[PDB]
């Protein structure tokens, strides 16, 4: 199925 996308909240 679909692969979930995420991001680091701090940069």
């Amino acid at each position: 199925q679909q692969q979930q996308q995420q991001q680091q909240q701090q940069g």
């Epitope: 199925q1 679909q2 979930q4 996308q5 995420q6 680091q8 909240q9 701090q10 940069g11």
Partner: antibody
């Protein structure tokens, strides 16, 4: 200790506009992604805006895209939400939020209510 | 299909007992990591934990260890061992999908837990 405090809510009419503010502290504001999330009178939670750490990117769900505008002033440690062409459905408690790790809404403010009449 | 979250029915519990709250991801997204939020009356929602497909999780700050999570396919569970009056709240799950073309974030309709 991370703290976020919203303000700017009040009574308005459909088609009007108002701008909300979120004073942030207890952390380095310019390093984190910020968000606005709202809660309808029915108590349903709903994400409404995203802005990257330096203001480079913004995203909105279709319900407000084109009407709302999220922005930030990093020197003032303040997040904003310009609400235009208000709709009855915009009536809700508005929360300012900051993330942590991969979690979008790690920290929430106290909220400010926006009431659209008529 | 649309990214949706379906939460178990609202129910009451007895102190010391154990609770299991369910949040079901839409089949097409059964591998997704979700979040559990706890909102007490007239209080802002509060971050409880991040729950992955393998059931592994990390709780937020201020969350008693009597809070744990697990998975079962598309289901994501919030377990509350023992129970106290302070656990009385609305528990809502959410799931984000930072798709470059367009961000998405859905919340379930919440599960009201009485004690």
């Amino acid at each position: 200790q991370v703290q976020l405090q919203e303000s700017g809510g009040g009574l308005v009419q459909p088609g009007g506009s108002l701008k909300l503010s979120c004073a942030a502290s207890g952390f380095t504001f310019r390093d984190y992604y910020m968000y606005w999330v709202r809660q309808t009178p029915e108590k349903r939670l709903e994400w409404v805006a995203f802005i990257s750490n330096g203001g480079g990117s913004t995203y909105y769900p279709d319900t407000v895209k084109g009407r709302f505008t999220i922005s930030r002033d990093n020197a003032k440690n303040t997040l904003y939400l310009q609400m235009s062409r208000l709709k009855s459905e915009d009536t809700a408690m508005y929360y300012c939020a900051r993330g942590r790790g991969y979690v979008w809404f790690a920290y929430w403010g106290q909220g400010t209510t926006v009431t659209v009449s008529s | 299909m649309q990214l949706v979250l379906t939460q178990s029915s609202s129910a009451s519990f007895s102190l010391g007992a154990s609770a299991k709250l369910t949040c079901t991801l839409s089949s097409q997204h059964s591998t997704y990591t979700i979040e559990w939020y706890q909102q007490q009356p007239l209080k802002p929602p509060k971050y409880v934990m991040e729950l992955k497909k393998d059931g592994s999780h990390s709780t937020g700050d201020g969350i008693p260890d009597r809070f744990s999570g697990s998975s079962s396919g598309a289901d994501r569970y919030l377990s509350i061992s023992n129970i106290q009056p302070e656990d009385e709240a609305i528990y809502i799950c959410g799931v984000g999908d930072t798709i470059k073309e367009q961000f998405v974030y859905v919340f379930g309709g919440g599960t009201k837990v009485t004690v």
